[PDB]
Amino acid sequence: MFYPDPFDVIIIGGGHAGTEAAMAAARMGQQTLLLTHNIDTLGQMSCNPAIGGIGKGHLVKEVDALGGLMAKAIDQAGIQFRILNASKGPAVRATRAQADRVLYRQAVRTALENQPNLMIFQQAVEDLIVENDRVVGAVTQMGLKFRAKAVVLTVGTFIPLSRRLRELPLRVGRLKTGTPPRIDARTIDFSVLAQQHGDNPMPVFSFMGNASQHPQQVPCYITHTNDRNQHQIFLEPEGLTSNEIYPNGISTSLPFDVQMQIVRSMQGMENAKIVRPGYAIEYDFFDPRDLKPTLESKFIQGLFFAGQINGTTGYEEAAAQGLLAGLNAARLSADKEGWAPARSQAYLGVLVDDLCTLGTKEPYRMFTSRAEYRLMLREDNADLRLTEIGRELGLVDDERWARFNEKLENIERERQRLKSTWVTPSAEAAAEVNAHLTAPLSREASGEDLLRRPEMTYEKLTTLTPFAPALTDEQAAEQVEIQVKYEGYIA
């Protein structure tokens, strides 16, 4: 039994990568069907309830800059927000946030349910359907068939689907992956534990969006065995209306036997009780070397792979692949050719190149070879290098495309204004200038020229009388400040 309407794009699984690949093809214009196991569990986080951190944050920001969901999603869902290495410089900072599981689930389901051009249907799968080497739709478990011009596969594979794939010279793999126990926050003594709060002012994951979006903030809690430099295990709350604690740090692979000791032998957690047991699922995947730069199979035409089937664990890594697969699966149906960001452009750049060639994600320490690329690929400038390319190809609406150009203006203007507004050995303004400047002034310099001074911050500089009102576009301000201050390096 076929199905009434034909689809351009089918997405199978829709987990983390799927969801993103869906929202992708949809806002592209194209008419997309998301098929899934279960729609009550979209945006479920099975591992760590968190978005961000080293390298992860980079990949997120990038997705948002191409208009995906995750950033917005976490902005709605994050009960704790942190910039890693606020201490150090722009190239080295990384945003990470704690997630209220349920609120994230809420947020992810909604945006999808209300996505123009995407239709969503709650069924398993049996196999897919190929015009001998060029795929044309898929067949659900219940026997219902949907036709399409392009497909995207994610979670689900591991039987008729399975055997079909092995009928090809696809290198199969193996993955050990599992999660810690989970603890009844009611049976934990928190008073005896230290606590971790969030940076303040709150960071904000989307280039769009802001702090008013975030729900109520909450702290994590530090604990360890029984500061002599011990091994600290972070206790994260699963959400605002949960009593479950994800104990970050304690071992994934473990019998329940020990599982209850390793947790009870911890400060405050003497008589803790353990609500979900920990475990490990090994699942096999396929080797990504059999995938075009655009994540289209080198074997079957029209098929794109993203997420678990590529051996990556990690929401952010899935999310990124999703988007990419999505937008190309989209471009295939429009009978145009797919896109693949080059290593110099983004993390998603390397992530896919890596996977295509290497067949795997190389560690983050290695994503940027020199020092310029570490600065030029920082997280807080994805929009400026990515957004437009996305706009140029459908991803990125008007709301965002207007916000982009707004701030693209404010940077252009301010820079130019600061290049032009000079203050001389006493323009008799030099009195209050030297109050916050290290070495005495004179050489007769423009705002730009003494912004480049290590003592000077755009925010402070501008409180000074000759340098006009500051910009009230704080995103742009930061980009202006670091543009003069650290593209002094690229000079």
Place this chain on the structure above:
Amino acid sequence: MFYPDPFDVIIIGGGHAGTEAAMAAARMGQQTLLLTHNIDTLGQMSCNPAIGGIGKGHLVKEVDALGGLMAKAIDQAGIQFRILNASKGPAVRATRAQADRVLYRQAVRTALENQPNLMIFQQAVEDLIVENDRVVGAVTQMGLKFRAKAVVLTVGTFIPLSRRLRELPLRVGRLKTGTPPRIDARTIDFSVLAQQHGDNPMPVFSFMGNASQHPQQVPCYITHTNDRNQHQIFLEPEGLTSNEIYPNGISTSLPFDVQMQIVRSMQGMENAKIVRPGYAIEYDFFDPRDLKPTLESKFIQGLFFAGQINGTTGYEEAAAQGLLAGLNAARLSADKEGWAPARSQAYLGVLVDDLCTLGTKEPYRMFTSRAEYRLMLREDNADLRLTEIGRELGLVDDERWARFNEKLENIERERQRLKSTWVTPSAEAAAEVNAHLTAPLSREASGEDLLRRPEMTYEKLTTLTPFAPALTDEQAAEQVEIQVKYEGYIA
């Protein structure tokens, strides 16, 4: 592998009956373990997103009056609240409400997670563990064993568990049960459809709780094929943050083939798309005639059955059994004897007697044989006949037990006050009295005596000058009014 702490009461499944049987044993005092498949899906409503209606409402109110969750739960979750037959008299009224699926889920999970003496653990089951005929705990799928003094089984059975039960002369059964499709509210035209709102002032399911608890109200929508007395199919919203529509009325058992026609051939729903397909699951159960009045198996001692395993479909029917099984499983561990309400006391009364003897739920038209019992077992007086018996045995806390006696006072007092406050052929107050009284007054009568008049309402009566301020306990007022007015019948 055994488990550290011993339990008094284990609950298996915890679905609708389970959940109630859990909250039950917990607040009883006893130390309870809820085991389940999945804790992300507690209080999931698989069928109609609704609580209440004919007979159902009766069973709910009763549960709440014994201190269970459902009433409170729906009070937090109901987007539409209605009293069926507001038109007619007290004995015939029934409350029904529409549920925001997710908010109900939220509400049910929370109360449990924060229930003293109940501990909850997310694991399947393999079998249970019996001291040859007297059960002493159960064994989870992962091999972990928990010991207990009493157990309660619900959803889950249908393999080692299954074979064990058939090793007994247990009459097995069969059940055809399924649900309609489910429709993308975005692809439905509502403008062309009429709409159904809720009674106003809003009813309120708990004897505790009130209208401020209820979330935002929303309407259902009426539609039919293509008012010549047609067969009307109600379109219910699944929730406030969902796009899914449960089409009440359209056939459960059906191929997807027809499924898309029967729905599209409807007003406003021409090009409707169908988000979850409909289906039917047949599952076998056991015959309830092998169960004591207290839902303890006549075979294996300590085991109690409630819900699906008894062949009942219906949340409210499960909920009621749960409570009952719960409180007795509780009483077994305290080495006291279990309780079973008699037919004259409550619906739960008949429901269990029926199931024990008949082996099934007889239709509601038959729950009350005469006419007095229909009035004496109305829904809006469960507390007065049930609550105390529950208090007397652990169910029912102080908060509720104080509210009970508060209103038990206000009825006692007011009645007595109205019996005592007489107004005579002109106490020169008789002027404005006859303004709203049908036949001219005089005979010299007490408030009670002219409340018994069909034209007179407690609310109106009391606006009259000799009859003091009304009672500001509206629950009590209603009970006072109907006590004089309809226990004129029982006289």
